[PDB]
Amino acid sequence: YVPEDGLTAQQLFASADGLTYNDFLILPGFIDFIADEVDLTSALTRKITLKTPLISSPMDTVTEADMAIAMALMGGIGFIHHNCTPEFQANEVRKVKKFEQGFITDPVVLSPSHTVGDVLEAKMRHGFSGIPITETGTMGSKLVGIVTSRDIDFLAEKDHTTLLSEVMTPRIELVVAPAGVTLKEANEILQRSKKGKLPIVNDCDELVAIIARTDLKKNRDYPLASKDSQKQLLCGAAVGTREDDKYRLDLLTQAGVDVIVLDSSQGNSVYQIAMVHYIKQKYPHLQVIGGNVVTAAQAKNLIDAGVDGLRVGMGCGSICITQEVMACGRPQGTAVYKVAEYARRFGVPIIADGGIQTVGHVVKALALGASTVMMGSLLAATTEAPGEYFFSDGVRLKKYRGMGSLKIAQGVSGSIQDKGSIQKFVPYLIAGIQHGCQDIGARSLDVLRSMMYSGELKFEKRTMSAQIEGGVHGLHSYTFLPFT
Amino acid sequence: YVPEDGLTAQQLFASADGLTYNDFLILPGFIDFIADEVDLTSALTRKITLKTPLISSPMDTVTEADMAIAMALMGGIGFIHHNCTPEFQANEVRKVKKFEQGFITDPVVLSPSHTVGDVLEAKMRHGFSGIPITETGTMGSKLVGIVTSRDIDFLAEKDHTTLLSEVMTPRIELVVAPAGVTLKEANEILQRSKKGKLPIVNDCDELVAIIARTDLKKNRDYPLASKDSQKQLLCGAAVGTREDDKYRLDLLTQAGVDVIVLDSSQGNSVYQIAMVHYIKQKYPHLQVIGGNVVTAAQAKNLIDAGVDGLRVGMGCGSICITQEVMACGRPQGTAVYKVAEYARRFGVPIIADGGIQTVGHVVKALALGASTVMMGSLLAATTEAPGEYFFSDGVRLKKYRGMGSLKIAQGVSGSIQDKGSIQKFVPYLIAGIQHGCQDIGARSLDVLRSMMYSGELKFEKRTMSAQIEGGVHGLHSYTFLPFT
Amino acid sequence: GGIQTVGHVVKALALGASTVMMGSLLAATTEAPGEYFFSDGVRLKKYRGMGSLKIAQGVSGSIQDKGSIQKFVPYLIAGIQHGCQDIGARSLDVLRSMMYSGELKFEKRTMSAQIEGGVHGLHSYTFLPFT
Amino acid sequence: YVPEDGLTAQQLFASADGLTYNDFLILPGFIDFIADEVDLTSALTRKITLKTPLISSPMDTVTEADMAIAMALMGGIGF
Numbered sequence A, B: 001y002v003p004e005d006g007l008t009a010q011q012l013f014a015s016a017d018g019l020t021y022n023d024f025l026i027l028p029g030f031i032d033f034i035a036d037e038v039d040l041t042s043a044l045t046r047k048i049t050l051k052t053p054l055i056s057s058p059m060d061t062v063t064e065a066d067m068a069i070a071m072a073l074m075g076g077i078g079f080i081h082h083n084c085t086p087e088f089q090a091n092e093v094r095k096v097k098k099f100e101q102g103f104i105t106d107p108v109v110l111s112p113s114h115t116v117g118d119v120l121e122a123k124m125r126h127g128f129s130g131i132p133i134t135e136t137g138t139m140g141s142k143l144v145g146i147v148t149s150r151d152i153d154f155l156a157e158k159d160h161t162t163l164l165s166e167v168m169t170p171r172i173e174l175v176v177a178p179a180g181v182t183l184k185e186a187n188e189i190l191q192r193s194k195k196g197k198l199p200i201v202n203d204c205d206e207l208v209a210i211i212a213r214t215d216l217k218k219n220r221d222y223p224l225a226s227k228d229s230q231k232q233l234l235c236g237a238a239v240g241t242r243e244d245d246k247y248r249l250d251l252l253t254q255a256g257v258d259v260i261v262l263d264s265s266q267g268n269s270v271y272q273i274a275m276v277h278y279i280k281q282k283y284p285h286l287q288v289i290g291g292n293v294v295t296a297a298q299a300k301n302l303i304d305a306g307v308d309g310l311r312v313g314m315g316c317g318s319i320c321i322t323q324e325v326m327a328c329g330r331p332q333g334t335a336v337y338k339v340a341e342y343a344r345r346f347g348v349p350i351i352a353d354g355g356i357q358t359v360g361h362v363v364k365a366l367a368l369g370a371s372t373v374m375m376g377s378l379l380a381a382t383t384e385a386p387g388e389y390f391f392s393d394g395v396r397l398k399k400y401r402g403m404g405s406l407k408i409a410q411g412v413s414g415s416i417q418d419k420g421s422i423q424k425f426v427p428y429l430i431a432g433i434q435h436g437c438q439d440i441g442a443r444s445l446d447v448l449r450s451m452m453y454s455g456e457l458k459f460e461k462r463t464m465s466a467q468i469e470g471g472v473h474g475l476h477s478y479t480f481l482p483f484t
Numbered sequence C: 001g002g003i004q005t006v007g008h009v010v011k012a013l014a015l016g017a018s019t020v021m022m023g024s025l026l027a028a029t030t031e032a033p034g035e036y037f038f039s040d041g042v043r044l045k046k047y048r049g050m051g052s053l054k055i056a057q058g059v060s061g062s063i064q065d066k067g068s069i070q071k072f073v074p075y076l077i078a079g080i081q082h083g084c085q086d087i088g089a090r091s092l093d094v095l096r097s098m099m100y101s102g103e104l105k106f107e108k109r110t111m112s113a114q115i116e117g118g119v120h121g122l123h124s125y126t127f128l129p130f131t
Numbered sequence D: 001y002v003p004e005d006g007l008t009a010q011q012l013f014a015s016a017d018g019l020t021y022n023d024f025l026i027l028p029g030f031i032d033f034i035a036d037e038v039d040l041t042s043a044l045t046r047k048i049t050l051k052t053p054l055i056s057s058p059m060d061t062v063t064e065a066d067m068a069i070a071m072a073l074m075g076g077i078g079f
């Protein structure tokens, strides 16, 4: 027999003293496994599951098309901000969705009568090189040939008037697959064909769809990417709660959004509940994420309205000044614990929103019940963030401002310190998270939360001196160098 | 008639007051042309000419294979440092040379009896994907087939034992060109072939050489690259003046160095002159660059020894502490002017070495007679610089230390502030240089120096208050944001 | 007085001074009188002028520790002889002969070259003389 | 023939502008020898000669018996 040490989560938060991420620790356990065995699959909404617990917040300083793509390629997800025109946001969503497609049912096509100028224009506009050619120049017509970049490289920049009929590979020479073939078999006939495209045709011999080799190359290159049933990246977008956001929502849903995150400082309001009802009534197949909530009472009515996933955290963001504009707020540790313990019964996952500044906080938030963790400032200065770097005091920086920072300024605008590529940063966050889980002794995140709720995971309250002692405190100067 | 204003160069430097880059200006002239018309072709040695005036200094914190490639791809050149093993430096030189080749006379080949594991190993080791296959597995044998990446992608990671005979395209199907064909015609048969390779063969039907499409793609992508007669990048390397550097020089010359830069703090010495003579005696086809010199007398004996190009500047580097270890030195403006005016008669170009910190200094050094300008600190923290970034005080930095900074420390070690890609930084330097030349009114750099020597380009001496006034002085805080 | 670097040690020997007297460089070496004391996370030895105190003609300060004299002086000698070598002088007598005969030629250094003559482009740095 | 560069000492100090150690340099020359061949014997007085040019100043914060010994052991002297 060995004495019990530490306080269970319910015992630590029973005092109602207002703890946060920096005021407690997790006592370590046992290791019977290697860190890489840790499984990080985390639920985002009741019908969406991610292969990593990391999300990017919807703001005008993060989550462009580039950041959304770079996040979706590592299992996470990206929420495009709504501080922009409805058609601009829909364009960004379409751009994120059209990255890898499989069956491309709406490609770019042309006709023999077109000219090399047309293929060059299509290239310069979209980036798609391959262009199937059809009699009429649309899908509902017989296939004639395909023109790609390798057919345009050797031109002399003065024969652009040449008709595409003189550069396409004729239909008789193409390799195609009959319509109705499953993707697996289509990928097989593409690979054994050892070529770059397969324009699918039917018994009538007219183009129906097309497949590309670089798509399966990307699949082989990024095993952890997040995709829907059509083998294309998942994308999210934020929306307000005005009567004029219905048009924006319609535009987004036509663009192909998968999950919508209602965006407000406080979720508890008739205005938000009405839009949740509207979304569930007009788009029954769309996943909606509730607004900011910090309380069980603040959640109950949103869950009743029909939110598929909640977003917990208010007044806590590294840019948020709600706690000073108004007196309202709640420390993030208490908020996460006391909205997750209530939400677990109805099966609605939670998103620990704001306040994350280190892998320690990323693992703490995942320990307290948050299925996934949303993160705005850490990803603020990565290469994928929108904007262009600028040199402030002998250092290149990217601006970082809250989306409501400006009648009243609820936020602040600042600068962050450059971090390199998201595709090279996220793996380090994943490695740190799984190392922390290993040290705790958790086979996975679901087990990590099971240990907490059953009482097996025991915390200890950290005083101020231990908070200072918990960092680096005895050095004259130093450097960090995370591997990233 | 309008009065003459300003001091010619000879009038400005006649006072022997020890001016530098910050103590004078160039009065502006007339504009009858657009900036982009400025031609920046600059001589490096008596038999090497560059399409840009920028060089990277040989140091252990710059000019790796990556930086040398990134510089050679923009017209400049890169000098690989000699603070490394002879075989390591030779490997770096060979790596820089084997970037784009045209006729690849020593490719990687294999034989039917090999296995897919062999092609995968060659890929993982070198990076070359295409591998012509021959009966014996060497050049002196009949060609049988070629295996590339598109023939290996669809394998299942468990049939690696498969013989390459089951994946190569057989000789009967290949497209080849007869031996003795000129490169232009070979490139033509490659482009009209609309295919990725041409393994050259002779009347005996055995492999002699091979060409690649990505090489001419790079040629089309980088019009300003610097290459020798064999269509591969120029590379330079530094060497010491000991009796044991002969082996290093032999290894480098076998690796294919084009220009050698004798590396010493002071060039005037029997030890340096003896190695200049040795190089000219054993490698008559090699361009050698003299050591650091600051005086006409200091140059005369090196020119007599046979230096093909001089390197002017001593005690001036942003990291150099020679002026404090010893009393010797000379301000860079006076040194450049008074070693270029002497060197012009013998036709030996000059390299303004050290002290450059801005495009203003880059254009000042080119105005005073320096055919090309060598630059170590500006390129110090770019992505291509050797080493990995590290976070010091909320900012990621790359170390920058002088190659002699450590019996006695003649240098210092510090940090620099990250600058992004060389391929994205050098174009901004070129644009700034040509804008300055345009403002002066010079059609090109040769005209810019002609105006100075003839007296048409007139400077003015800048006092301390104008030095402060010449910058930014009235702002509380600010940002720069160069386009780069 | 006024010597602060091997550069000044060689400059003073170039201008005619047969030998050079030096007070501050040797101030904090282990052999200096007194005991080290920690001021701001650093152990230092006091350094004050002998007339620093009716009237104070001097000042009292602190210096930064330098290790043994027997391990410091050889580095000064090595630096001096390296500077003489770079000048091209077989010895100090020859170094002064060249100056008086006119063979040793100086150049006047302006303020910008004084800044340029040091370390000026680094964010932070370290020196580490071998000593 | 190679032009003369720089100012002799008498030419540099003729201006009576008040130069110091930080306001001038020595232009470099030629090397036909190794550094260790440099001989540093320096005269201290008319009847005393030292093997190094370094002296320690007489002050209450330097030149005790220990510093005088440590200096005399390297050719110099201690006051």
Ligand SMILES: NC(=O)c1ccc[n+]([C@@H]2O[C@H](COP(=O)([O-])OP(=O)(O)OC[C@H]3O[C@@H](n4cnc5c(N)ncnc54)[C@H](O)[C@@H]3O)[C@@H](O)[C@H]2O)c1
Binding pocket: A240, A241, A242, A243, A263, A264, A265, A266, A271, A292, A313, A314, A315, A316, A317, A320, A322, A353, A354, A403, A404, A410
């Ligand atoms: N998560 C955080 O910590 C946090 C906090 C504050 C702000 N923010 C960010 O700033 C943005 C702005 O926040 P906000 O709360 O000021 O904006 P908001 O639109 O969510 O709320 C501001 C006001 O809008 C009103 N409103 C909403 N719908 C309405 C309707 N249909 N009719 C009439 N009035 C209506 C509300 O009553 C409220 O007074 C958020 O969308 C979010 O991106 C985040």
Ligand SMILES: NC(=O)c1ccc[n+]([C@@H]2O[C@H](COP(=O)([O-])OP(=O)(O)OC[C@H]3O[C@@H](n4cnc5c(N)ncnc54)[C@H](O)[C@@H]3O)[C@@H](O)[C@H]2O)c1
Binding pocket: B240, B241, B242, B243, B263, B264, B265, B266, B271, B292, B313, B314, B315, B316, B317, B320, B322, B353, B354, B403, B404, B410, C085, D031, D033, D034, D035
């Ligand atoms: N350009 C600058 O401002 C500058 C200044 C100082 C140092 N540096 C860098 O630091 C490096 C080191 O400079 P350094 O002058 O100390 O090194 P170096 O080898 O060039 O000279 C140092 C010593 O080597 C001796 N030496 C050279 N060849 C010899 C031989 N064959 N036999 C005997 N002795 C020989 C010289 O006599 C001299 O005393 C340089 O190569 C350069 O990269 C640059």
Ligand SMILES: Nc1nc2c(ncn2[C@@H]2O[C@H](COP(=O)(O)OP(=O)(O)OP(=O)(O)O)[C@@H](O)[C@H]2O)c(=O)[nH]1
Binding pocket: A100, A101, A102, A103, A183, A184, A187, A211, A212, A215, A216, A219, A222, A223, A224, A227, A231, A232
């Ligand atoms: N054309 C095409 N095929 C794809 C794409 N992504 C996956 N596939 C194919 O669809 C199947 C997906 O199974 P896996 O290869 O295991 O892919 P994965 O890494 O599990 O990725 P997911 O299946 O999305 O979880 C295989 O036949 C893939 O080759 C894509 O973007 N385009």
Ligand SMILES: Nc1nc2c(ncn2[C@@H]2O[C@H](COP(=O)(O)OP(=O)(O)OP(=O)(O)O)[C@@H](O)[C@H]2O)c(=O)[nH]1
Binding pocket: A098, A099, A100, A101, A102, A104, A107, A108, A126, A127, A128, A129, A130, A149, A196, A212, A214, A215
């Ligand atoms: N830009 C663009 N990409 C599309 C479009 N539709 C599908 N894609 C996908 O984007 C990629 C476009 O591939 P291509 O531009 O043909 O690529 P490529 O010419 O083979 O060149 P690389 O793949 O880059 O070597 C594929 O992954 C397509 O599935 C479209 O309309 N525009």
Ligand SMILES: Nc1nc2c(ncn2[C@@H]2O[C@H](COP(=O)(O)OP(=O)(O)OP(=O)(O)O)[C@@H](O)[C@H]2O)c(=O)[nH]1
Binding pocket: B100, B101, B102, B103, B183, B184, B187, B211, B212, B215, B216, B219, B222, B223, B224, B227, B231, B232
């Ligand atoms: N195979 C091959 N051919 C090349 C390469 N570089 C240039 N060429 C060809 O050689 C000739 C070079 O002439 P240009 O096309 O004008 O090239 P450039 O931009 O002037 O480059 P340089 O000729 O090196 O100055 C053309 O036939 C090119 O296609 C290369 O790396 N590989």
Ligand SMILES: Nc1nc2c(ncn2[C@@H]2O[C@H](COP(=O)(O)OP(=O)(O)OP(=O)(O)O)[C@@H](O)[C@H]2O)c(=O)[nH]1
Binding pocket: B098, B099, B100, B101, B102, B104, B107, B108, B126, B127, B128, B129, B130, B149, B212, B214, B215
């Ligand atoms: N790594 C490597 N490159 C070589 C070698 N010899 C020549 N090269 C050049 O390096 C490039 C190698 O091209 P590959 O690796 O075949 O390129 P690829 O498979 O066509 O793929 P991408 O060109 O990157 O789309 C060409 O520019 C060659 O000319 C070698 O031995 N190793």
Ligand SMILES: Nc1ncnc2c1ncn2[C@@H]1O[C@H](COP(=O)(O)OP(=O)(O)OP(=O)(O)O)[C@@H](O)[C@H]1O
Binding pocket: A129, A130, A146, A147, A148, A149, A150, A151, A168, A169, A173, A174, A175, A176, A195, A196, A197, A198, A199, B194
């Ligand atoms: N399905 C197909 N059947 C027959 N020929 C095809 C097919 N797809 C492409 N081609 C032809 O093959 C050649 C190049 O095909 P590929 O797909 O490699 O082009 P690409 O991918 O744009 O080349 P690159 O690697 O330069 O981007 C062209 O002649 C093109 O018309």
Ligand SMILES: Nc1ncnc2c1ncn2[C@@H]1O[C@H](COP(=O)(O)OP(=O)(O)OP(=O)(O)O)[C@@H](O)[C@H]1O
Binding pocket: A194, B129, B130, B146, B147, B148, B149, B150, B151, B168, B169, B173, B174, B175, B176, B195, B196, B197, B198, B199
């Ligand atoms: N000269 C040639 N003649 C005939 N077939 C060739 C020739 N060169 C390559 N191939 C074949 O063409 C196919 C792919 O050629 P390609 O040069 O596009 O490969 P790759 O450049 O490695 O492709 P990727 O774009 O994926 O890198 C393979 O079947 C290869 O064996």
Ligand SMILES: O=c1[nH]cnc2c1ncn2[C@@H]1O[C@H](COP(=O)(O)O)[C@@H](O)[C@H]1O
Binding pocket: A057, A058, A059, A313, A316, A317, A318, A319, A320, A321, A322, A353, A354, A355, A356, A375, A376, A377, A378, A401, A402, A403, A404, A405, A406, A410, A411, A412
């Ligand atoms: O202007 C703003 N005011 C207040 N909160 C904001 C503002 N913009 C974004 N936020 C939120 O602040 C959090 C930012 O996460 P962080 O990385 O902890 O700063 C997220 O919840 C954002 O949605």
Ligand SMILES: O=c1[nH]cnc2c1ncn2[C@@H]1O[C@H](COP(=O)(O)O)[C@@H](O)[C@H]1O
Binding pocket: B057, B058, B059, B313, B316, B317, B318, B319, B320, B321, B322, B353, B354, B355, B356, B375, B376, B377, B378, B401, B402, B403, B404, B405, B406, B410, B411, B412
């Ligand atoms: O350790 C060193 N001491 C002195 N000079 C150095 C050292 N390393 C490099 N240098 C030179 O200092 C110059 C650096 O250029 P910068 O960019 O002006 O610093 C070049 O001449 C380098 O060759």
Ligand SMILES: O=c1[nH]cnc2c1ncn2[C@@H]1O[C@H](COP(=O)(O)O)[C@@H](O)[C@H]1O
Binding pocket: C001, C002, C003, C022, C023, C024, C025, C048, C049, C050, C051, C052, C053, C057, C058, C059, D057, D058, D059
């Ligand atoms: O109290 C003082 N006032 C003024 N000069 C002093 C005093 N003490 C020492 N000195 C002199 O100042 C010089 C010190 O050399 P330093 O190393 O250049 O400071 C020597 O000439 C000392 O003799």
